[PDB]
Structure formats: structure tokens, C-alpha cells
Paper text:
We studied the prevalent cytotoxic CD8 T cell response mounted against severe acute respiratory syndrome coronavirus 2 (SARS-CoV-2) Spike glycoprotein269-277 epitope (sequence YLQPRTFLL) via the most frequent human leukocyte antigen (HLA) class I worldwide, HLA A∗02. HLA A∗02 is an MHC class I molecule that presents processed intracellular protein antigens at the cell surface in the form of short peptides 8–10 amino acids in length for inspection by CD8 T cells. The dominant Spike epitope was narrowed down to residues 269–277 (YLQPRTFLL), and T cells that responded to this peptide represented >1 in 10,000 total CD8 T cells in many HLA A∗02+ CP with the majority of the nine donors using a TCR made with the TRAV12-1 gene, suggesting a potential shared or “public” response (Ferretti et al., 2020). The Spike P272L mutation that has arisen in at least 112 different SARS-CoV-2 lineages to date, including in lineages classified as “variants of concern,” was not recognized by the large CD8 T cell response seen across cohorts of HLA A∗02+ convalescent patients and individuals vaccinated against SARS-CoV-2, despite these responses comprising of over 175 different individual T cell receptors.
To understand why this single amino acid substitution had such a drastic effect on recognition by many TCRs, we solved and compared the structures of YLQPRTFLL and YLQLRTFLL bound to HLA A∗02:01 at 1.67 Å and 2.0 Å, respectively. Comparison of the atomic structures of HLA A∗02:01-YLQPRTFLL and HLA A∗02:01-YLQLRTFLL showed a largely preserved fold, but with local geometry alterations at the epitope residues 3 to 5 (Spike residues 271–273) which presumably form the majority of contacts with TCRs. The HLA A∗02:01-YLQLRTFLL structure shows fewer internal contacts that maintain the shape and dimensions of the bulged part of the epitope, which may result in the collapse of the peptide bulge upon approach of the YLQ TCR. A comparison of the Wuhan and P272L variant peptides may also suggest why the YLQ36 T cell does not recognize the P272L variant. Structural analysis of HLA A∗02:01-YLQLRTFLL indicates there is a lack of intra-peptide bonds present in the P272L peptide compared to HLA A∗02:01-YLQPRTFLL Figure 7A. The lack of support in the P272L variant peptide resulting from a lack of intra-peptide bonds may cause the peptide to collapse under YLQ36 TCR approach, displacing the peptide and abolishing peptide:TCR interactions. Bulk sorting of tetramer+ populations was used to generate a T cell line from nine of the CP. These lines all responded to YLQPRTFLL peptide (13–53% total cells) but completely failed to respond to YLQLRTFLL peptide despite this sequence showing slightly improved binding to HLA A∗02:01 compared to the parental (Wuhan) sequence. The ability of the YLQLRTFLL peptide to bind to HLA A∗02:01 was also confirmed during tetramer production.
Author numbering:
A (entry chain A): 1 to 276
B (entry chain C): 1 to 9
C (entry chain B): 0 to 99
The structure:
Amino acid sequence: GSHSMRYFFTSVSRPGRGEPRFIAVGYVDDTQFVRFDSDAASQRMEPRAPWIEQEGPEYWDGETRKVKAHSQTHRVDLGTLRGYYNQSEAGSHTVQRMYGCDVGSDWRFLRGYHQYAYDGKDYIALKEDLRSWTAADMAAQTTKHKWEAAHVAEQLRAYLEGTCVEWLRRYLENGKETLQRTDAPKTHMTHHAVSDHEATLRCWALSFYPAEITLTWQRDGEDQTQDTELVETRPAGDGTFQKWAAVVVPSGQEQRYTCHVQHEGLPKPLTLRWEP
Amino acid sequence: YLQLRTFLL
Amino acid sequence: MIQRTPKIQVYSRHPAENGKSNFLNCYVSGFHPSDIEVDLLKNGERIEKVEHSDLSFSKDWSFYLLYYTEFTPTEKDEYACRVNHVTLSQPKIVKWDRDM
């Protein structure tokens, strides 16, 4: 099915007037493959996956030069935004940037992204047409006008529709064993007596990849959201993911309830029932 | 593979 | 300035078994800004040598980190994750529960 390449950049000015933190992470789908972290005293773009580590010194020198260029960009951006918003240097502020591309099962371009937040809220985003900007507030209007006058969108489209897709395809071919895998969830149900009057049924999904999954409860084959709880999907630490969903049910009624698991790695959706 | 160009807010 | 409080999950990488080597995880998500203090506790005391993932963020711009350490669980030993963030007036402690 689909694949994506994404870069996530975080830039944090510190209380007072010293050096900001800069971190850059790259993903293909839910697999981290590169990092650069000023709080780790990084000097180089560093590999996080076997299939990227096999690239030669040319690749690694090139990625190192470019990540240092991105760092210097965000250094300027922190100063620019203090100016746009009339903020002192005493405060700590955050710039985030995300860009990348999605490809379909045919490995053709579907979508590109290039978007920013400032202090936890949208700042500016490239629209899906890759020609126009959404500016969240009056200050992001300044960036929009500058980027329209400077024709920035046309240079980003060339990368997002061309280079980005071409390198994702190389990564998918080189990493095929890792990136083109699906690990189906290992599923089970638990039962915890809350009182004599209620039980918790907890439906588990473990060691799945990719992260995308749906756990849903039914009662007598009808959708059930009342008295349910569902945790954020979480990383196991070995490149797979976990999730659970739970429902609190009256004593004696356990058999009414079914858990439904959907995941790209399953040949068909699963149905789980509590088995005395 | 990172973008080659630099654009400033 | 939008601030968001972290969601905390404490869990093991593998199903827990006494005297089997495993990883204790503390996953913090949904938080802003990114500065956060995460300690892993054994019997109420900070584990010195803990590892973490590289800071990244979700579509809504909220951050996520995984803190982890290699450990061998036993019946007696208790583990928790202690989290402080500008949104929290004091550290929040989430106990590890083998069935969550």
C-alpha cells in the first residue's frame, strides 16, 4: 500500500539568550532512519536503520551539510518570529517544521507537505495543490507574501513531486525486508472484576507494524462507545506498536461484547470474544 | 534525502 | 503560546516474566512545549542509566518521547515513571501495572 517519507524539525530557543536546541528526525512510514540532535552534541546526520547505514560517504557528507543548513535556517526563523510577534529574547519559543511525500501502491506521487508551527499552533502550510499557502494569522501573512513574491512554492513542488519520491523509492527498494513488511497484531482479551457488579474487558493488540490500527467494541453486534477507554498507540521499542481498548460491562453480560481489530497485516478483520 | 534549498520565514 | 499536558503510559516491551530480561518503557505524548523531565523509578528511586527516543511530533504538532531501560522484573520489585512539565504543578507518578 501507501508509503511516506517525512522530516520533523524542532527548534527551541532557551530561557535567556544562549544557543537553541535543533533536532531533525527522518521517517519512512513508522521507521526512523536518520537523526541530528544539538542536545546530543551531534556533528553528523546519523543512521537509525541498517538499510540507510549501507549508503556511502558521499550520501552522509551531503546529508550532514544539508541538516547543518536546515539548523542555520531555524536559527534565523527564531529571531524573525520574535520580531513579527514583538517578543523579548528572555522567553523560550518553539519552531516546528514538517515536510515530505506520500506514494501509492504503484509508488507514484499522491501528496507533498511543507508546513510550520510556532509555539504549538499552525503558522504557515503549503496547500495540497503545492502552489499556495495557508497563513494561520496576521504575522504568517508576511511570510506568505514574501514566499509568493519569491516563488518558493514552485521550488518546493519540484522536490516534493520529484527528488522526495525518487529517494523514497530507493529507500523502499534498499530497505524492502524492513519497510515493505506488515506485522499483524497479536491479539488477546483479559477480564478484571472491578466489583461483584461490573467487569473490565480489555482487548489487546501487540507487536504490529505499521502503527495504523482500529480497535472497536460492539454489544450484540452494535457499535459500543459508552463505558469504553482506548489508549494512544505506543511504540514497543523494537520498531513494533501496541494498543488496547477496554469496556466496563455488567456481571453476567460478558458474552454480549465483541472486540474488532483492523490492520493492513491481517488477511481479514478479527473478532475477539471473552471465553470463560 | 533533505531539500537542497533554504527558505526563510 | 499553547501548552498541552503529557499523556503517560508505563509498560514493558514484552509480556513481563520474573527473571526474564525485558525493557521498561515510559511513553509521553500530546505535550507542548517540548521540555519535559522523565525519570524511571525502581522502588521509588531514580534509575541512573535510562535511554530515550529522538523528539518527534504528531500531525497536531504535539510531541512524543519514549524513555526506556533494560530490566529483569521480579514478584517484589515495583517500577514507575515520574514526569514533570511546565503544565504540572508537581511531578506525576504512573506505576507500572503488568496488566496495562
